[model samples]
Target: GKELVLALYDYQEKSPDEVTMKKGDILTLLNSTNKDWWKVEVNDRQGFVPAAYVKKLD
Candidate 1:
């Protein structure tokens, strides 16, 4: 898949074990398949994010 750049404006790690990001944070898409969950890398931390939460970059 084509890697892409996106951003997250609302992210909070419910637990240290889960992926976390800050508001207005930028991230890179690692992998996705038109699914509900997408894998991305933020702050060098790799994890899964809800597809609805991610927005495309220009």
Candidate 2:
């Protein structure tokens, strides 16, 4: 099952492995194995972002 998420705030990548997401951006949750960072896919790109940066949609 695919989970959708909404970006709570704009996030700038501190590393190349992370994707930059703007506030209110919609993204697909890929993995949540890490407590602090979760993997997401947006614009056909995959990267890790802070788990706290986004909110899961119902």
Candidate 3:
């Protein structure tokens, strides 16, 4: 597994606005692959991040 996006600050649940995910904090990917450009979630919230940013763990 890999943490796809890093949050620079603490994020809170918000509506009608993007959550302020910080720079160093990691966001766990619900589903992502090397072939895909975007990470998807069960709720269908998708975020586009470079694949190089994610570090997979064995």
Give the winner by lDDT.
2
Lowest summed lDDT across 10 adjacent residues in model 3 is found at 36-45
Tell me the RMSD of model 3 versus the true structure: 6.5
| Decreasing TM-score order of the candidates | 2, 1, 3
Ranking by lDDT: 2, 1, 3
TM-score, structure 3 vs. true: 0.35
The C-alpha local distance difference test score for the whole of candidate 2 amounts to 0.91
Which residue pairs in candidate 1 have backbone atoms (N, alpha carbon, C) closer than 3 angstroms, thus clashing? none
lDDT of 2 at 23: 92
Tens digits of per-residue lDDT for model 3, 1-58: 4444544334433543223344464555655554643252213344444444444432
Query: Stretches of candidate 3 above 4 Å error?
Result: 1-22, 34-46
Please give the distance, in angstroms, between residue 3's alpha carbon in candidate 2 and its true position after superposition: 0.5
lDDT of 1 at 14: 65
Candidate 2 has what TM-score?
A: 0.90
> What is the lDDT for 43 in model 2?
79
